[PDB]
Amino acid sequence: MERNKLARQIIDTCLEMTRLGLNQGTAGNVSVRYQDGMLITPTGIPYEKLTESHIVFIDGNGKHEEGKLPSSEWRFHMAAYQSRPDANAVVHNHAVHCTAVSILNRSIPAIHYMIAAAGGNSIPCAPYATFGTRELSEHVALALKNRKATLLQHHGLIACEVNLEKALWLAHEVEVLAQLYLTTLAITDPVPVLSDEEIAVVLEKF
Amino acid sequence: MERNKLARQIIDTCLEMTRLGLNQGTAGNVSVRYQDGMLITPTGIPYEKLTESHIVFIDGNGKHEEGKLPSSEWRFHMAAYQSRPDANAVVHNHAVHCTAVSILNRSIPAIHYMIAAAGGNSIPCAPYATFGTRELSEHVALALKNRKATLLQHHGLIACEVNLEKALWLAHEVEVLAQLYLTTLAITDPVPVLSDEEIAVVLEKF
Amino acid sequence: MERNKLARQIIDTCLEMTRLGLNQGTAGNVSVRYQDGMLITPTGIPYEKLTESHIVFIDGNGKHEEGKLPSSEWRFHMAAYQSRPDANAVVHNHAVHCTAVSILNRSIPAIHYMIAAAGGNSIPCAPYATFGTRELSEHVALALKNRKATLLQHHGLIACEVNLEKALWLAHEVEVLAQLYLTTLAITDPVPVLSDEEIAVVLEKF
Amino acid sequence: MERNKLARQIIDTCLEMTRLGLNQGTAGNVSVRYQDGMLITPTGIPYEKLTESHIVFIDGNGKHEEGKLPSSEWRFHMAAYQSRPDANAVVHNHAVHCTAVSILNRSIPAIHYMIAAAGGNSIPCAPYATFGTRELSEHVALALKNRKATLLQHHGLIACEVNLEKALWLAHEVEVLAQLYLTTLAITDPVPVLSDEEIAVVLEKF
Ligand SMILES: [Cl-]
Ligand SMILES: [Cl-]
Ligand SMILES: [Cl-]
Ligand SMILES: [Cl-]
Ligand SMILES: [Zn+2]
Ligand SMILES: [Zn+2]
Ligand SMILES: [Zn+2]
Ligand SMILES: [Zn+2]
């Protein structure tokens, strides 16, 4: 674990996240668990201007290194890490389809077998609270108790995994599931779903 | 403030606007406040052929330099500048989702907290008037009185900010909000929204 | 008018058409009026393998040069040229949104002022007939009598103008109008439209 | 037929499949009939890291070469080859629009004349069974009896042809048909379709 290799990967994740079309508009933030705190993207610097030197470190007490301002949404990354001790990377964005489903304040049900990737038969939707607020942190910490990803009402998506690319994958996969959901929901409501049992089998094979 | 640095930035904005997919089809126009008038993109020259020498200057009386024809939609950029004395850059386009919402002649309500970026709890929709017409100018001037962005009925979007990239961001952000609106509107009407008060809090934190 | 400059432009149009996302899937065909016949893209050669030598010439009697097979849809390009003597370039594709509207067998009404670009207050939809059939030719010739573009039922789009880039623009603009149509149609039917008179004014300013 | 030329083409297909936007999210798998077995993409290696050496060979008894793990979905490629003895390439993905239609568990009817490309007047939808399961193999083998492509319920798409690019084309064409279907279905249900007879004519001209 070297501070700079981790910093390079974070910028690469931010770039790749723009490449898949998850980033752009409000823009997300990425972080990796590090030492006692975490390394997180800074607030207000477009991925283009980013460099290893812009990545900020927040320790265990929420104290960030002097002269650097972490993401304005840094509080819930810590809630992510505290809630899922197995997570080493948190990716947060305001991707279009995820955000739209959270505007309807709905969980995404087992419409496709890959939903097992988040750890169960659903992608939850955490209740609304002002961004960067402590109450929002509880909402998300509670949602990630049993799921690796959650939607944030009238907000976006937050997904975590053991490393950055698996976290990016998950986040990207949740956009896909969100889009399949919106698309079929506009034709039939409720949308057909796989039973909990089939999901159990898939979870088994995963 | 150097005429040519500003001209280069305008072409870059036009290029970037095509990159985000806002431009193309009818095509937009960009301008920056300058001296007593403004520097605006010329009518009928695809971003590709553009150069610093094509950027036209219109003074305070609406007089443009000889041999150059400004954008056919130059009149409402002036209405933008006159209405918002704090705006130094106006970006206008006919982006797909913004235009679709203006076809329904609806304002975009507080469906996501970022709507506070336009200065309030909504993105208005100005009434229709022929393009390049003076009546259209009033409609837009009235809409931008209290908002940094407005939709134009059966037309498109017009957004302004203190500089070009913030204006481009806003314009891009309004497309996102427009798309979240259409998507959820096709499933439920009315779409859930944040109360004016929550918006007030966000405006506070912004 | 040099056979090879025209051939290079056609391949460029085919490439650009793929770039805007109009081409791909079934794939389109482009042609330019030439001498007594026309120069048209050949059947079954992906834009990538294309070269000036693949562009085929069909004379006035429908006879093509030996050893080269023109587009399987060459018959209606001739109907385009015969119907609109002012057209020097025909672009045909099976773009997604245009094709979807033609599946509903609906004309696109005056939902946006740019519809005047096709020459009136609507984009018609020609009746169905097997592709490469002579009856299909009449359907399209009749539709282009008074419009520069037309949709083909359960088929796609065909647009013409005085040169290739204006034809490409139009075709691209019709996809935009098609998409605005589908999007608002899924929320309200009928979709609000500009009166014939407003269109008349726009036609005047165009 | 050289093992390595085939391996290079498979990686190129995987890359191109990402380029059209079919791949990404769950990710697909490609294979080519080879000797007594087939050459298939390996499980868990992003197209970027892929190389000729990662392509795995499974013989006729389902035995794969030591030290290499084939795609977790290799069983139904064999069902593809056994069902369609004329197929030499199978492309499988979880493309967005195909998957959404299979979530509704609907076949795609003759909404556009190109549907004849799959061999008839429809694109079927095979019933659900756990991935990599033998029962899923029967479902797909039965569906491909008379069609070159089939959708897999709550899963994705599987298309085959005589070679890789024709298989890629078909797969891409099915996404298009899937999208035209969803789009018009959200406005009218049932969506207008061409009669079996018209399809017969097209099949004739194909
Ligand atoms: Cl549970
Ligand atoms: Cl107000
Ligand atoms: Cl008329
Ligand atoms: Cl049959
Ligand atoms: Zn956020
Ligand atoms: Zn305009
Ligand atoms: Zn065609
Ligand atoms: Zn699969």
SS (H, E, C) A73-85: CCHHHHHHHHHCC
C176 → closest Cβ in B25, B130, B154: B25
* Inter-chain CB proximity C113 and B186 less than 8 Å: no
Method: X-ray
Rg over CA atoms, chain A: 17
Give me the residue from B24, B103, B182 closest to C192, CB to CB.
B103
- Residue D20's contacts (CB-CB under 8 Å, 6 or more residues apart) are C24, D168, D172, D175
Instruction: Please list every residue in chain D whose beta carbon sits closer than 8 Å to the beta carbon of residue C97.
Output: 183
Q: Which ligand is nearest to the CA of B146?
A: 2
Q: Are strands C108-109 and C89-93 parallel, antiparallel or unpaired?
A: unpaired
* Chain centroid to CA C130: 17
Q: Do A185 and B187 touch (CB under 8 A)?
A: yes
What are C's interface residues with D at a Cβ cutoff of 8 A? 24-26, 94, 96-97, 99-100, 103-105, 128, 130-132, 154-155, 182, 185-186, 189
Helical (H) or strand (E) element with D122: strand D122-123
In this complex, the chains that touch D, judged by 3 or more CB pairs closer than 8 A, are A, C
CA of B115 from ligand 5 middle (Å) equals 13
D95/chain A closest Cα distance in angstroms: 9
**Which helix H or strand E contains A12, and what residues bound it?**
helix A3-19
Q: Is the dihedral of CA B94, B100, B101, B105 positive or negative?
A: positive
- The rounded Cα B118 to chain-centroid distance in angstroms is 11
Locate all alpha helices (DSSP H) within D125-195, ordered by sequence: 134-143, 164-185
Report the gap between the CA of A188 and the closest CA in chain B (Å): 10
SS3 A133: coil
CA distance B73 to B43: 8
Q: Give the residue from D200, B25, D192, D180 showing the smallest Cα distance to C156.
A: D180
Instruction: Enumerate the domain spans of chain B.
Output: 1-206
CATH architecture of A1-206: 3-Layer(aba) Sandwich (3.40)
Does residue B80 contact residue B144 with C-beta atoms inside 8 Å?
A: yes
Report CA(A155)–ligand 5 centroid distance (Å). 6
| Nearest by Cα to A97 from D24, B20, B182 | B182
Q: Are C141 and C79 in contact (CB under 8 A)?
A: yes
Which ligand minimizes its atom distance to the CA of D130?
A: 8
What is the longest distance spanned by two Cα atoms in chain A? 53
Quick one: residue C116, left, alpha or beta (phi over 0 = left, psi -120 to 50 = alpha)? alpha
CB contact under 8 A, A154 and B202: no
Contacts of B80 (CB under 8 A, 6+ apart): B87, B90, B140, B141, B144, B158, B160
What residue type is assigned to position D12 of the chain? D
With contacts defined as CB-CB under 8 Å, which chain D residues touch C100? 179-180, 183-184
Contact list, A191 vs chain D (CB under 8 Å)? 103-104
Side-chain half-sphere exposure of A72, counting CA atoms within 13 A: 12
Note the maximum CA span of chain C.
Answer: 53
Chain A nearest CA to B198, separation (Å): 8
Q: What are phi and psi of D168, to 5 degrees?
A: -65, -45
DSSP string of C38-82, one letter each residue: EEEPBSS--TTT--TTT-EEE-TTSPBPTT--B-TTTHHHHHHHH
Q: Determine the Cα angle at A181 with ends A177 and A186, to 5°.
A: 155
Residue B69 to residue B54: CA distance in whole angstroms: 9
Amino acid identity for residue A90 in this structure: V
The C-alpha angle B108, B114, B120, rounded to 5 degrees, equals 60
First to last CA, chain C: 28
C64 is in an annotated binding site: no
For residue C70, the cross-strand partners are C42
Question: How many CB atoms neighbour CB A87 within 10 A?
Answer: 22
Radius of gyration of chain C (CA): 17
CA distance B49 to chain C (A): 14
> Which residues in chain A have their CB less than 8 angstroms from residue D26's CB?
114, 173, 176
Residues making up the binding site of B for substrate:
28-29, 43-44, 71-72
CB A12 within 8 A of CB A91: no
Task: Determine whether C204 is an active site residue.
Answer: no
The token duo for A192 is 């057909």
Regarding beta strands D149-152 and D125-126, do their DSSP bridges make them parallel or antiparallel, or are they unpaired?
parallel
Helices (H), B41-163: 75-83, 96-103, 134-143
Distance C70 CA to ligand 7 centre (A): 13
Strands (E), chain B: 29-34, 37-40, 56-58, 89-93, 108-109, 122-123, 125-126, 149-152, 156-161
Q: Is A13 annotated as a binding residue?
A: no
Task: Flag whether A156 is marked binding.
Answer: no
Locate the chain A residue with the closest alpha carbon to D186. A187
Return the exposure string of D95-129: e unless at least 16 CB atoms fall within 10 Å of the residue's CB, then b: bbbbbbbbbbebbbbbbbbbbbbbbbbbbbbbebb
**Residue in chain C nearest B95 by alpha carbon:** C176
Adjacent-strand bridge partners of D40: D31, D56
Which positions of D are catalytic? 73
Asked if D183 and C26 come within 8 Å (Cβ–Cβ), the reply is: no
Number of alpha carbons in the 13 Å side-chain half-sphere of residue B63: 5
DSSP label at C191? P
Say whether C30 sits in a helix, a strand or coil. Answer: strand
Q: Please list every residue in chain B whose beta carbon sits closer than 8 Å to the beta carbon of residue C188.
A: 104
Chain D residues in contact with A205 by the CB 8 A cut-off are 130-132
Tell whether residue A71 is among the known ligand binding residues. yes
User: Measured between beta carbons, which residues in chain A are less than 8 angstroms from residue B205?
Assistant: 130-132
- Give the length of chain B: 206
Task: Write the DSSP assignment of D30-83 as a string of letters.
Answer: EEEEETTEEEEPBSS--TTT--TTT-EEE-TTSPBPTT--B-TTTHHHHHHHHH
Among C24, C43, C99, the strongest candidate for a mutation testing the D interface, having the largest count of D CBs within 10 A, is: C99
- What is the arrangement of strands in the sheet containing C56-58, beginning at the earlier edge strand? C56-58, C37-40, C29-34, C89-93, C156-161, C149-152, C125-126
Residue in C7, C8, C74, C78 with CA at minimum distance from that of residue C36: C78
Separation CA C126–CA C136 (nearest Å): 8
Residues C148 and C86: beta-carbon distance below 8 Å: no
Left if phi > 0, otherwise alpha if psi is -120 to 50, otherwise beta: which for D67? left
Burial of C19 (0-12, 13-18, 19+ CB in 10 A): exposed
Q: Which residue of C has its CA nearest to D201?
A: C130
Smallest Cβ–Cβ distance between B130 and the set C176, C184, C201 belongs to C201
Question: Of B2, B16, B73, B161, which residue is the catalytic one?
Answer: B73
CA C15, C20, C24, C30 torsion-angle sign: negative
**Cα separation, A13 vs A7, whole angstroms:** 10
Using CA atoms, how far apart are residues B94 and C180, in angstroms rounded to an integer? Answer: 11
What resolution, expressed in A, was reported for this entry? Answer: 2.7
Alpha helices in chain C (DSSP H): 3-19, 75-83, 96-103, 134-143, 164-185, 196-205
Amino acid identity for residue B179 in this structure: Q
Nearest chain A CA: its distance from D57 CA (Å): 23
Contact at 8 Å (CB) between A42 and A90?
no
* Nearest chain A Cα distance for residue B201, angstroms: 8
Instruction: Please choose, from the candidates C117, C108, C121, the residue with its C-alpha nearest in 3D space to the C-alpha of residue C198.
Output: C121
Q: Which residues of A touch B191 (CB under 8 A)?
A: 103-104
* Interface of chain B toward chain C, CB-CB under 8 angstroms: 24-26, 94, 96-97, 99-100, 103-105, 128, 130-132, 154-155, 182, 185-186, 189
CA angle centred on D187, ends A157 and D24, rounded to 5°: 35
Considering every ligand atom shown, identify the ligand nearest to the alpha carbon of residue D118 and give its number. Answer: 4
Per-residue DSSP letters for A45-103?
Answer: --TTT--TTT-EEE-TTSPBPTT--B-TTTHHHHHHHHH-TT--EEEEE--HHHHHHHH
Residues 6+ apart with CB under 8 A from B122: B107, B108, B109, B110, B115, B147
C154 to D205: CB separation less than 8 angstroms, yes or no: no
Query: CA-to-CA distance for D117 and D148, rounded, in angstroms?
Result: 8
When CB atoms are compared, the residue of B20, B173, B191 closest to A26 is B173
Taking the centre of ligand 1 as the mean of its atom positions, its distance from the CA of residue A115, in whole angstroms, is 13
Which member of C112, C188, C202 has the closest CB to residue B104?
A: C188
DSSP annotation of C128 reads P
| Helix, strand or coil, per DSSP, at residue B167 | helix
For tokens 């050459």, name the residue: D39
Report how far residue C115's alpha carbon sits from residue C198's, in angstroms, rounded to the nearest whole number. 12
Task: Name which of A103, A130, A134, A181 to mutate to probe chain B: the one with the most chain B Cβ atoms within 10 A of its Cβ.
Answer: A103
Per-residue buried b or exposed e for D29-56, using 16+ beta carbons within 10 Å of the residue's own CB: bbbbbbeebbbbbbbebebeebeeeebb
User: Taking the CA of residue D131 as centre, how many other CA atoms within 13 Å lie in the half-sphere pointing to its CB?
Assistant: 27
Long-range contacts of A117-122 (CB under 8 A, 24+ apart): A117/A148, A117/A170, A117/A173, A117/A206, A118/A147, A118/A148, A118/A149, A118/A159, A118/A170, A118/A174, A119/A146, A119/A147, A119/A148, A119/A203, A120/A146, A120/A147, A120/A199, A120/A203, A121/A194, A121/A196, A121/A199, A122/A147
